[PDB]
């Protein structure tokens, strides 16, 4: 076992799991889900004594809410069995335990509803509504909604009740930023886009509205059920180990077409 030395002792035997997922979405103008997947990693940070037999249990459905892995690679320390149990003697400190992909039953934490109105050929009226879709006790953090503007843009007027927004002319986008937002809510932004005149013939190819966010759950639906520690020499049971998990779900590509 060349990934863990043999001397290791801690009074405080503790581990931390980070489930880190990036959720990706392409949505049609009329709310259809054109494409969506999650990529995830589980990172383990183990401060455990001796050489212990860890067993990682999740809400895998092949084994309540239960979920569907398309595929995954593991860290060499993992004993490949097909009971679908995850067994290993972990390296010390921090390492990547598994990497995975999911396409089915994904929680899309945000819904984006765009509305666009042409006003002659002098301006565009734009309304965008975002809906948080997740437990109300949970807050999303670091929410950005990026609304692209045409190249013939004289100037931009925006109102929003939540957040701050700026027209960023060099980037050709309005950028709305919200610090915090809770589950099962709505917010909207209105903007009026002043146009320059332009070659009437070439039309605007409206790129998507994209979002960034971070959420404290796994959009795949993954929940950690247990992490079991057995060290058969040393005199500490499983229930002596202090165990922690956190979830950090972040947008990848998360685009809604208008």
């Amino acid at each position: 076992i060349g990934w863990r030395r043999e001397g290791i002792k801690y009074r405080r035997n503790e581990l931390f799991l980070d489930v880190l997922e990036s959720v990706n979405l392409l949505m049609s103008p009329q709310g259809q889900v054109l494409s969506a997947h999650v990529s995830g990693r589980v990172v383990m940070k183990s401060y455990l004594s001796g050489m212990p037999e860890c067993k990682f249990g999740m809400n895998d459905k092949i084994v309540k809410q239960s979920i569907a892995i398309d595929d995954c690679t593991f860290h060499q320390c993992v004993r490949l069995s097909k009971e679908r149990s995850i067994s290993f003697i972990p390296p010390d400190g921090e390492f990547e335990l598994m990497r995975y992909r999911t396409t089915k039953d994904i929680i899309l934490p945000f819904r984006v509803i765009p509305l666009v109105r042409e006003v002659g050929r002098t301006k565009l009226e734009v309304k965008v509504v975002i809906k948080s879709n997740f437990k109300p006790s949970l807050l999303a953090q670091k929410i950005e909604v990026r609304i692209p503007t045409p190249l013939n843009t004289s100037g931009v007027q925006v109102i929003c009740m939540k957040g701050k927004a700026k027209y960023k002319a060099s980037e050709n986008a309005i950028v709305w930023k919200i610090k915090r937002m809770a589950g099962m809510k709505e917010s909207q932004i209105s903007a009026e886009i002043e146009l320059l005149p332009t070659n009437d013939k070439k039309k605007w190819a409206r790129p998507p509205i994209s979002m960034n966010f971070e959420v404290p759950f796994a959009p795949s639906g993954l929940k950690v059920r247990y992490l079991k520690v057995f060290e058969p020499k040393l005199n500490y049971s499983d229930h002596d180990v202090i165990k922690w998990v956190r979830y950090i779900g972040r947008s990848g590509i998360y685009e809604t077409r208008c």
Partner: peptide, 6 residues
């Protein structure tokens, strides 16, 4: 943000 595994 870290919670106990129950």
């Amino acid at each position: 943000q870290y919670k106990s595994i129950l």
